Amino acid sequence: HMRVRLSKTLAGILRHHPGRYGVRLTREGWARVSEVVEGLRKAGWSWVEEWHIVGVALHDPKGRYELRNGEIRARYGHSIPVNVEPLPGEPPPILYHGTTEEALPLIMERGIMRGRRLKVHLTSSLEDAVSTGRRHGNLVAVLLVDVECLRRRGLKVERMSKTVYTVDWVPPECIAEVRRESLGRSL
Ligand SMILES: Nc1ncnc2c1ncn2[C@@H]1O[C@H](COP(=O)(O)OP(=O)(O)OC[C@H]2O[C@H](OP(=O)(O)O)[C@H](O)[C@@H]2O)[C@@H](O)[C@H]1O
Ligand SMILES: [K+]
């Protein structure tokens, strides 16, 4: 059984559509693992028990998930209202946001915007930013974001996972540099 497939479904439950799987989240995003298990089994994940859900969280390379006795939440990525307490640590001076080349004109006009999610997501990993952009297209641009530019105008940059940070919005003036990574047809 591929952890990655169960993880993609679990993330959708914990970020976007918990009710579709019989789950109610707390205001801090916490689901009862027992409810997640039942909803998955009803959707055809006939082998899944608490052990497997807990394992998805423990083995996740990014720290997408958090566990405590009986419960699991996503640390970030939500489109439904939750308040997730940040992890300790200060943000680095530069963070990355991966996107597509086609989005650059509107990002330069309106800033990096949260879209359907509660926050803009930034990473300390250039390679992760590239993979994030590649979810949307083959011609990717990575924006280098000046974190002190965000902070000094009152935009808190919160650590959600070891490498993933959230902010309400990134003003275009805080984009320090644009790096391109391209796939597919050579230009
Ligand atoms: N002004 C503007 N005009 C036009 N387009 C604009 C724009 N501002 C931003 N955009 C783009 O609008 C898209 C929104 O798309 P999304 O909501 O999926 O955001 P995202 O791609 O950051 O991804 C979130 C996390 O979700 C995944 O995490 P996981 O692996 O699932 O854990 C990822 O890796 C991340 O961490 C992105 O292309 C933005 O650049
Ligand atoms: K923080």
Report DSSP state, residue 118. Answer: S
Chain breaks in the chain (C to N over 2.5 A) after: none
User: Resolution, rounded to a tenth of an Å?
Assistant: 1.5
Quick count: other Cβ atoms within 10 Å of Cβ 27? 8
Which class is domain 94-182? alpha beta
Amino acid (one-letter) located at 172: P
Query: Ligand 1 pocket, 132 CB below 6 A?
Result: yes
* C-alpha R_g of the chain: 18
In this structure, which ligand is nearest to the CA of 10?
A: 1
Cα–Cα distances in angstroms (integers) from residue 93 to residues 9, 64, 169, in the given order: 34, 23, 16
Q: Is the CB of 114 under 6 A from ligand 1?
A: no
Tell me the backbone φ, ψ of residue 53, rounded to 5 degrees: -65, -45
**Cα gap 140→137, rounded to integer Å:** 7
b/e map 153-183, b = 16+ CB within 10 Å: eebebbbbbebbbbbeebeeebbeeeeebee
Which CATH fold would you assign to the domain 3-74? Arc Repressor Mutant, subunit A (1.10.10)
The whole-angstrom separation of Cα 96 and Cα 129 is: 6
List strands edge to edge, sheet with 94-100: 158-159, 164-167, 120-123, 94-100, 139-146, 175-182
Ligand nearest the Cα of residue 85 is 2
Enumerate residues 6+ apart whose C-beta is below 8 A from 169.
111, 112, 113, 114, 120, 155
Residues contacting 93, CB < 8 A, separation 6+? 146, 147, 148
113 CB near ligand 1 (under 6 Å)? yes
Substitution candidate for ligand 1 out of 107, 132, 139, 162 with most atoms within 8 A of CB:
132
Q: Where are the domains of the chain?
A: 3-74, 94-182
Which residues sit opposite 31 in a β-bridge?
A: 72
Contact 73, 28 (CB under 8 A): yes
Query: What residue owns the CA closest to ligand 1's atom 32?
Result: 64
Contact 66, 26 (CB under 8 A): no
Q: Angle, to 10 degrees, between the axis of helix 33-42 and the axis of helix 3-15?
A: 110
